[PDB]
Amino acid sequence: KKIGIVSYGAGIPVCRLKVQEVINVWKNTDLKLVEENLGVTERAVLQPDEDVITLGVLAAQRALDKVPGHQIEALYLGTCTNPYDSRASASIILEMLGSGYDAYCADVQFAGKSGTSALQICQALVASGMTGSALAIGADTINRNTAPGDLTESYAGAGAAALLIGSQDVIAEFDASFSCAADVADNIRPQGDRYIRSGMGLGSDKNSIGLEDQTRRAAEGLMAKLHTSPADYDYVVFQQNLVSTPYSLAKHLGFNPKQVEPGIYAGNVGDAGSASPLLGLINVLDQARPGQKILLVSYGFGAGSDAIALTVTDAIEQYQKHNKPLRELLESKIYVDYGTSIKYEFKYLRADYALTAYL
Amino acid sequence: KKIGIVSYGAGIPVCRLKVQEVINVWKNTDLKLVEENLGVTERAVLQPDEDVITLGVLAAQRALDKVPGHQIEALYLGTCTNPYDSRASASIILEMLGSGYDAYCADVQFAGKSGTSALQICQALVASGMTGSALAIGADTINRNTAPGDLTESYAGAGAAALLIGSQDVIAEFDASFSCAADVADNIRPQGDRYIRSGMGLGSDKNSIGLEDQTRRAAEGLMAKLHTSPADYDYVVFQQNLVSTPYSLAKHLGFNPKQVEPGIYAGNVGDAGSASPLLGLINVLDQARPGQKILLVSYGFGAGSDAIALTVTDAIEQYQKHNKPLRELLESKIYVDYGTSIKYEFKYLRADYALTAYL
Amino acid sequence: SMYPEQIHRMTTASMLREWREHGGKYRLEGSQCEECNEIFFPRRTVCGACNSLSVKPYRCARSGKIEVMAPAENPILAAMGYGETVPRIMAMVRLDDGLVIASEIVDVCDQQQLKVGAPVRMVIRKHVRESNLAWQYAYKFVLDI
Amino acid sequence: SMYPEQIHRMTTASMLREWREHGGKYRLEGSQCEECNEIFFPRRTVCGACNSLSVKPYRCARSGKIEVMAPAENPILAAMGYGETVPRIMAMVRLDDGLVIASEIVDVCDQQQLKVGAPVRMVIRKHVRESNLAWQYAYKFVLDI
Amino acid sequence: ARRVAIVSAAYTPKPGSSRVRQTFKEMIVESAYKALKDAKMHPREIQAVAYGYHGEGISEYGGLGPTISDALGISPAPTFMSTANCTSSSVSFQMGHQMVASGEYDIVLCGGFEKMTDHFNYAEYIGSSTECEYDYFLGISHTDAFALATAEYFQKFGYAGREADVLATFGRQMRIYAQNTPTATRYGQPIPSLEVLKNSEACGSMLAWGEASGCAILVAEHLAHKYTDKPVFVRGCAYTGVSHYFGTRFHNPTLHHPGLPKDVGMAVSANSIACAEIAYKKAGITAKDIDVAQVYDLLGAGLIQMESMGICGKGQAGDFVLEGGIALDGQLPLNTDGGNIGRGHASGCDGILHITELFRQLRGESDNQVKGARIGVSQNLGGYAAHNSVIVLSND
Amino acid sequence: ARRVAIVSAAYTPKPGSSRVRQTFKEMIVESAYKALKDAKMHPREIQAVAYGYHGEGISEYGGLGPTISDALGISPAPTFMSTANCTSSSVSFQMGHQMVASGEYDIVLCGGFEKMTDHFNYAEYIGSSTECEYDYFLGISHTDAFALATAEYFQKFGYAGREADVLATFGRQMRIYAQNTPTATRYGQPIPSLEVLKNSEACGSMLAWGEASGCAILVAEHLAHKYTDKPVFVRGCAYTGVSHYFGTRFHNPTLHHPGLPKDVGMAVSANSIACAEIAYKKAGITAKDIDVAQVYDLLGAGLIQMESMGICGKGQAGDFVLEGGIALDGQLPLNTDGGNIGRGHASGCDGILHITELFRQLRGESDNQVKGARIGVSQNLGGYAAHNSVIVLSND
Ligand SMILES: [Zn+2]
Ligand SMILES: [Zn+2]
């Protein structure tokens, strides 16, 4: 019996901010560039009562709702916008889920590839026989950790995705993976800094030495291991900080648009970091058919890349029978203006010590 | 030959923010309260290239333009929102004015009464014979030092007023003054804090123990010294953080509305702190007649009050002949939205270290 | 910040307070009596019906209906940590097991669906931060439609 | 600092509290009865001796002697705002008018002069900062020799 | 058991207004010495005190008893403290009644105070007296509970379309009573029209909140003639307690009182019903016997208490108010001083605020006098009726 | 007036130790239901509760009465709260005595608790129950007051050179009493030598501080036989209050008690002397009659209270202790459970901690039994004797 994904879930903020609302204030980038070339018209706004833990536990609880009475054996939280810098937020999510304390547990960090790295850890724990199952979460509040006036502000979002790994009722078999990494400081966040920073100007030069190099290296590595090529895959899923990014990487690695399209979700969300490759995968599995082949290649700034190959099983049809797809979830939204978004995300420079709510 | 005011000038920011723009975002106070009871419909917004020094030197240069070739003998800068906490911004303004270095010079601080305190210092320097003339400035950027979401945000403004004291071509003779003070921490700003803070909830209870107590004490003190009563004055000028404040204090001290009205300017400006009593005085002198009597009573939180009595002279008619009144100056305005106001006033929580303008 | 002189504060919470209530606040656990099966929220040590000490944790139903609802819009009554969202929709939620929970409704995407009798479900959200610096998490409700 | 989310705090002081006590705390003003001349510290509204409401402010004597003294060195009992100076020399000071004040002795330049019966005088010093951010000032004592 | 008489009662005037120039000690002394004077009594005749406040979180003064005994100038005479929301004074009154009735003390001063302005923002502190881990720390207030209670009342007893009319008629009657009552915060204010009130905050049913201290002096029957010609006797009291948690109003198996209504909630206060029934049994009366009353008014809470107290049937208090039933010529005159809306509210003092007006009524000294008043009743609550007190006074 | 009997008394064992795994509600229930069982009584027979704690600043739970009535499962039965430093339980006992003696309630549960670990650092919170503006806000603690009181006692009564000997002998006797008392925190610990104690913290006279709840059940005499064969009767109580401000100990014209000593201060507690004299007059006893006692021990406070209480003359308590006077074979056995040093201290529970050991003594059930004990006395204080309570119990 093969090992892989059994169930999944997602958590996305409902508040939305149209790109023009940010551009009207800062006038620091072209509206047409962001809407048409990059492919993002609005982005998710984090409410004051939302964070990585609230989104993560929502996604996780939605995955576990598919498997009544599941006892948790391992739980790994992939995030680069962790609410805690010491102590594991994973243990907080575990406590909330209320399905066992005897679990392998940690937070995992490598930027946008944190979620795929957690997934690989969970696969290794099941495949080794160290556990019978394992829960991987990928979640980020990129909005919260992107500065007002930053060139990326208008498309910084947030999100969470949860994948349960096991060997009973598997809907996507985990076939193989390949990872790579290096010191490439294309983006950083030094200890203390709230805001994620760029290491150079934005554009294809920065993309060539990080995003494209590592994505290519991992994809070619895995395909070489499996003796496959782009033609052998029904779907390809990349990092989706922007709608343009998967299409661009696909053109760079010899995949074609119809292999990419079914993973695209982020036009109304923006960059969800660690969640983005996992959300692309979820968007595929929501409509995929038994027998189909998926290649998933994430990207973490810093930098590195995780490549994973999957095969969809017969069980996907039963899983799909009564399932709320991600496409439907993303229809739920509340529009807010720029001022309200900044209030909600705690980006006004207010007093260090508050006397009342407003003094 | 009697001693007093010879010429004056004012400096006000041109950018404006309608009160409803702030209330739409924070929903932390009533639109009707601020517009109708407090009397403020819009407030001054400080541009990124404006501050206490920029406004102060504008006002001062406008006063000195009335007296060609004047050599400066003393210059005192009254402000509670000083650009420097050590070193005197007054010496920077002196340098800019380019009319002599051999001057008595310092910054003066007692909250909203800083400007009137500077004025008293200048009067004392001339009346003592230590100088032949002296330049007093009152200026504040209350907006810059009021926090986003503060109950006072929607009516925090900025401004500067300059008064030249001398004994040649005097337009308002300085008759007498009376000052009082105490420890009353109704508002504070501890060393380091950017934002001015309240010591208790807003309303008539707070007003009774600071604003009204000290204003009454100084006004009654001065009137007792001169054997006068409210009926003896053609004009009364109070602190004008709000249009409602002079009318309220007038009702409290037995003055009537027609004595107050000619000093009212702040409906489109908001609180200009140290500048506000001096701007009220300027607004009176712009239209006053020879022989008329003015009572000026300021208020500094902390707390204390400066009362000054003046008599308008025959020279006012010549001064008024070719004069741009404050009423006309305040017609120059540029409307901005909330987001733009916050950008201009540096109230977004951006990164401590900037890589470019937008990264 | 620049001057690290300690400021006076009468009360600082120990972690023990919230530690013991994770069942109640993360998992909506009240109590059920082992002898008579009566249910209660919040959790308790003595059954109120029969005064037995044989009481166990009980997972309350996480679905319900709005019994009664009231906007909170008055700035005068804005609590610290809850000033940013205005209005707040306060509600008494009747759970499917019969218990009633005092909470609020959030994420209202269609205002015409917010009414008495509307179905709701529990969600975990961030509440006012603790006086020991730990983030506070607890329940709120959303419309379920 | 970087995340301006308001933290929970049960109690925040109004400026009114200290405002009314500036006489007591800056100037060592207690009360004297106008009818019987008895003196008290701290200030009060009713004379304790005769129950008259005719009571006025009274400037207590600012010189005195150490009646009793005790070091405070136990870290367990260090209050916030008072942890930096160790030991603290707590004392009951008998003022020259007969009243007794609970305070501490500071600036002890010669330790051999710190003893019971030693003469002391009042000084104004900075105490624990207020919960509304204002600096707190009040009395302490020094050896006077 | 022996009878206990009230010989005087007094509070610091305009309790819906603040006294920022006074300390809490000064404020307590004012009302205490006023009452002592009214009774022709010396402070040193007081053998004990029972006093109430919200708690130590307002002024940061705890263990307050000795501090009060020193402030009043009665040491060594003890002060027993009470900390019980808006019922603190009601509870302290009951404690004093027990002190005298026991024979342990013959003359006892009962009272309470609140100095809200010592706290920067008292409104957000008050929630600390609730089921804190499941309401206060989630940003849920007592005012939320009253808003919800009012909404439940109107939605379930068929008042849709007349909510504004009911609340405004109530608030207007309170203003009418306050206009001619010198100790009231709204003394001398002109009476706004019903239409003006409907278009104002809370349709005119928002209370006036300030600062006050108050007290009543209790004496053993055999001594009362030394201090007054016209003593007011305590017939009976009840104090009852249920969970602070608002959810429990709908389902509280912990509350053992037989013959409660089948359907209880916020609009039907089970704790308040139980309290009234116990109190009336102890006092030897029924609701029929009540000539004048006091209730904690705020939004529709006056209606809910009118029903709990037994003055009108379930769901009928709104119509009772609309038909003029609480006016001075009505079937049951209520809050004849103006109540919390007209006279004013100061949490820890509220019990004495009620008792003083009833005291005056029962001696013929009220500004809005109920002719031939024999029985007067205070219905008071704390939290959302987590505390409930019913106190029955008579004049013979 | 009718007599009031204690039918049971109990507390959560090892009160000098903490119970971090329990909530305060769980802890209260433990001792309450233990006492109910000891008395062969059902919770729903309880007609009222009087309960004590330090205040709302520890757990941020105020208006606690209803919360306790719900936790115990007695609603609608009321809980009257008491907030009075380390005397909270002593005061609540006196309140319950009044409730029963009045005839208003026949069966009343009296008690108190403290959950210090709910606060991050309780030690710095406690100062909030003092004359706060002139001590707490200047960093002056209750522990400073006790250190100073001890220093005054020794310096003025000629104990120079024997301070360590007195404090160590006291602390050693407490440890001896605790060793064989199962409910004590120092149960079963080996007895350190006098020399080891002298060289340890506070010469062995530092208390053990933890968490506990406790209660006693009071019943009208005519009902007591239903619940126990051996009732313990309340002979008389006194509670007294003076300023919290430590300076006033030396000069307090506000304290009107005739025949006090000429020279009062910290070493001579005027409030405590007054309290004892009042209590004994009410109880119909003198110090001669006392067979066994309890005092609040900490440093030299036990000595000061031994003198205030009338057990030995001014300045003689140190020598009384050195001569073996508080040992089980001594002239006056004292703190026979181990006291605060041996048994342990939890502020709001301390009154019941005293009363339980006296209750046991008066029924012949103590682990360190005083043969033929007829009269037992609790002397307790709050702040630096700002509150003072003296409670006299007998067995016939
Ligand atoms: Zn049961
Ligand atoms: Zn006197």
Q: How far is CA F336 from CA C4, F206, F358, in A?
A: 49, 17, 9
Which residues in A lie closer than 8 A to residue E124 (C-beta atoms)? Answer: 356-357
Chain B residues with CB-CB distance to C7 below 8 A: none
Which of E54, E185, E203, E46 lies closest to E118 in space, CA to CA?
E54
Tell whether E121 lies on the interface with B, counting CB pairs under 8 A. yes
CB contacts, 8 Å: E73 with chain F: 254
- Which of E79, E67, D47 has the alpha carbon at shortest distance from F253? D47
* Residue F250 CA, distance from chain mean position: 24
* Cα A53 to Cα A92: distance, rounded to the nearest angstrom: 8
- What value, to the nearest 5°, has the Cα angle with vertex B178 and ends B176 and B179? 145
User: Which H helix or E strand runs over F113?
Assistant: strand F107-114
Residue D130 dihedral angles phi and psi, to the nearest 5°: -70, 155
Instruction: Mark yes or no for CB contact E247/C41 under 8 Å.
Output: yes
Peptide bond between residue E76 and the one before it cis (omega within 30 degrees of 0): yes
Q: Which secondary structure element, helix H or strand E, spans residue E252, and what is its range?
A: none
A246: helix, strand or coil: helix
CB F355 within 8 A of CB F198: no
Q: Where in chain F are the domains? A: 1-396
Tell me the three state secondary structure of residue F223: helix
Query: What size, in residues, is chain E?
Result: 396
Is the Cβ pair F25, C44 closer than 8 Å?
A: yes
Q: DSSP character for A208? A: I
Residue F286 exposed, middle or buried by CB count within 10 Å (0-12, 13-18, 19+): exposed
How far is residue B55's CA from residue B64's CA, in Å, rounded to a whole number?
Answer: 14
Q: Which residues pair with D64 in a beta bridge?
A: D95, D120
Q: Are F336 and F364 in contact (CB under 8 A)?
A: no
Provide the token pair at A298: 């994430």
Identify which of F70, F34, F30, F22 has the alpha carbon closest to the alpha carbon of residue F49. F70
**Amino acid letter, A245:** T
Resolution (angstroms) stands at 2.8
Do residue F23 and residue C10 have CB atoms under 8 angstroms apart? Answer: no
Tokens of F230: 């051996």
Tokens of E365: 């000294």
Strand pairing category for A172-184 and A4-11: antiparallel
Ligand 2 center–CA E24 separation, angstroms: 21
CA E146 to chain centre: 16
Sheet holding D55-59, edge to edge: D39-40, D29-33, D55-59
The count of C-alpha atoms lying within 13 angstroms of the C-alpha of D133, restricted to the half-sphere facing its C-beta, is 24
> β-strand A15-18 against A334-335: which pairing, if any?
parallel
**Length of chain D measured in residues:** 145
Pairing of strands D119-127, D100-106: unpaired
Chain B positions in Cβ-Cβ contact with residue A343 (cut-off 8 Å): 25-26, 149
The residues near E315 (Cβ < 8 Å, ≥ 6 apart) are: E153, E156, E157, E158, E307
Reading the block at residue B83, the tokens are 């650009």
HSE, CB side, 13 Å, CA atoms: give it for residue E391: 31
Give the Cα separation of B139 and B282 in Å (integer): 14
**F27: helix, strand or coil:** helix
Look at the alpha carbons of C48, C49, C55, C60 in this order and tell me if their dihedral is positive or negative.
negative
Residues of D in contact with A146 (CB under 8 A): none
Distance from CA of F15 to the nearest CA of C (A): 19
- The total of other beta-carbon atoms located within 10 Å of residue D32's CB is 20
Read off φ and ψ for residue B140, nearest 5 degrees: -150, 145
How much is the CA Rg of chain C, to the nearest whole Å? 18
The arrangement of strands across the sheet holding E4-11 comes to E79-82, E48-52, E107-114, E212-220, E4-11, E232-241, E387-394, E375-382, E292-295
Cβ contact F81:F65 at 8 Å: yes
Cβ atoms of A41 and A18 within 8 Å: the answer is yes
Please count the residues of chain A: 359
Q: Is E58 exposed, middle or buried (0-12, 13-18, 19+ CB in 10 A)?
A: buried
Q: Is the peptide bond before D42 cis (omega within 30 degrees of 0)?
A: yes
Residue type, B305: S
CA gap E30, A187 in Å, rounded? 68
Tokens of E237: 């009291």
How close, in Å, is residue E279 to chain D by CA atoms? 35
E-chain residue closest to F385, CA distance: E66
If one counts every other C-beta atom within 10 angstroms of the C-beta of residue B20, the result is 15
DSSP notation for A18-74: EHHHHHHHH--S-HHIIIIIS--SEEEE--TT--HHHHHHHHHHHHHTTSTTPPPSE
Greatest extent of chain B over all pairs of C-alpha atoms, in Å: 65
Contact E305, E272 (CB under 8 A): yes
The three-class DSSP label of residue A238 is strand
Tell me the C-alpha distance between E210 and B205, whole Å. Answer: 11
Dig out the tokens for C46 from the structure.
């003595």
Distance CA A3, CA A311 (A): 11
Question: Strand pairing partners for A9?
Answer: A162
DSSP D53: S
On whether any CB of chain C is under 8 Å from the CB of D102, the answer is no
Q: What are phi and psi of E70, to 5 degrees?
A: -70, -45
As a whole number of angstroms, the distance between CA D68 and CA F147 comes to 10
Of A25, A193, A340, the CB nearest to B343: A25
Q: From A123, A85, A103, A144, select the one nearest A93 (Cα to Cα).
A: A103
Asked whether the CA dihedral F218, F220, F225, F229 is positive or negative, the reply is: positive
Domain ranges across chain A: 1-359
Q: Which amino acid is at F116?
A: M
Task: Provide the residue type at E100 as one letter.
Answer: V
Distance between CA F168 and CA F177 in Å, rounded? 14
**DSSP secondary structure letter of residue F201:** G
Experimental method: X-ray
> Greatest CA separation found in chain A?
65
Eight-class DSSP state of D57: E
Q: Please state whether beta strands B104-108 and B42-45 pair in parallel, antiparallel, or not at all (unpaired).
A: unpaired
**Could you say which of D1, D4, D6 has the minimum Cβ distance to residue A357?**
D6
Closest Cα to residue D56, out of D23, D38, D33, D39? D33
The total number of residues written for chain C in this structure: 145
Is residue E19 exposed (0-12), middle (13-18) or buried (19+ Cβ within 10 Å)? buried
Tell me the CA–centroid distance for residue F268 and ligand 2, in Å: 25
Q: How far apart are CA A28 and CA F235, in angstroms?
A: 86
Contact A307, A120 (CB under 8 A): no
Distance, CA of E12 to CA of E27 (rounded, Å): 7
CA quadruple E141, E243, F346, F98: dihedral sign: positive
**Residue F395: exposure state from Cβ atoms within 10 A (0-12, 13-18, ≥19):** middle
Q: Which residues of B lie inside 8 Å of A (Cβ-Cβ)?
A: 24-26, 28, 147-151, 193, 195, 197-198, 201, 337-340, 342-343, 346-351, 355-359
- Cβ F299 vs Cβ F378: under 8 Å: no
Cα gap F240→F274, rounded to integer Å:
8
| Assigned token pair, A254 | 């010899």
Residue E308 near residue E265 (C-beta atoms within 8 A)? no
D119 strand-pairing partners: D65
Q: How many other C-beta atoms are found inside a 10 Å radius of the C-beta of residue F201?
A: 10
For CA atoms E219, E222, E228, E231, the dihedral sign is: positive
Compute, in degrees rounded to 10, the torsion defined by CA atoms D75, D76, D79, D81: 40
d(CA E284, CA E355): 19
Cβ count near B357 (within 10 Å): 9
Cα–Cα nearest to E213, from E348, E313, E293, E113: E113
Q: Do C21 and E133 touch (CB under 8 A)?
A: yes
Contact D134 B199 (CB under 8 A): yes
Instruction: For residue F135, report the distance from its CA to the centre of ligand 2, in Å.
Output: 25
The Cα F189–Cα F344 span in angstroms is 14
Helical spans, DSSP H, in chain E = 24-38, 65-72, 88-101, 122-125, 142-156, 163-179, 194-198, 221-224, 270-283, 301-308, 317-322, 339-342, 350-362
Q: Distance, CA C46 to ligand 1 centroid (Å)?
A: 8
Which three-class secondary structure state does DSSP give residue A248? helix
Give me the residues paired with residue F293 across strands. F334, F377
Ligand 2: distance of its center to the CA of D56 in Å? 11
Distances (CA, A) of C145 to B124, C33, D58: 76, 33, 72
Please give the Cα distance from A251 to A245 (Å, whole number).
10
How far apart are the C-alpha atoms of A194 and A345, rounded to whole Å? 12
Phi, psi of E175 (to 5 degrees): -60, -40
Residue closest to A274 by CA, chosen among A134, A162, A144, A129: A162
**Which chains border C (3 or more CB–CB pairs < 8 Å)?**
A, B, D, E, F
Spatial CB neighbours of E195, under 8 Å, sequence gap ≥ 6? none
Ligand nearest to the CA of C48: 1
**Cross-chain Cβ contact C7/D131 below 8 Å:** yes
Query: Are residues B350 and A148, on separate chains, in Cβ contact within 8 Å?
Result: yes
Cα(F70) to centroid of ligand 1, in Å? 14
C107 and A332 in contact by Cβ < 8 A? Answer: yes
CA distance E211 to chain A (A): 21
Tell me the binding residues of C for Zn(2+): 33, 36, 47, 50
Give Cα B243 distance to the centre of its chain.
Answer: 13
Tell if the CB–CB gap between A58 and C79 is shorter than 8 Å.
Answer: no
Neighbours of A208 (CB within 10 A): 12
State the Cα–Cα distance between residues C140 and C104, nearest whole angstrom: 6
SS3 content of chain C, % helix, strand, coil (to 5): 10, 40, 50
Cα C61 to averaged position of ligand 1 atoms, centre (Å): 20
Task: Please tell me the distance from the alpha carbon of residue B213 to that of residue B187, in angstroms, as a whole number.
Answer: 15
What's the Rg (C-alpha) of chain F? 20
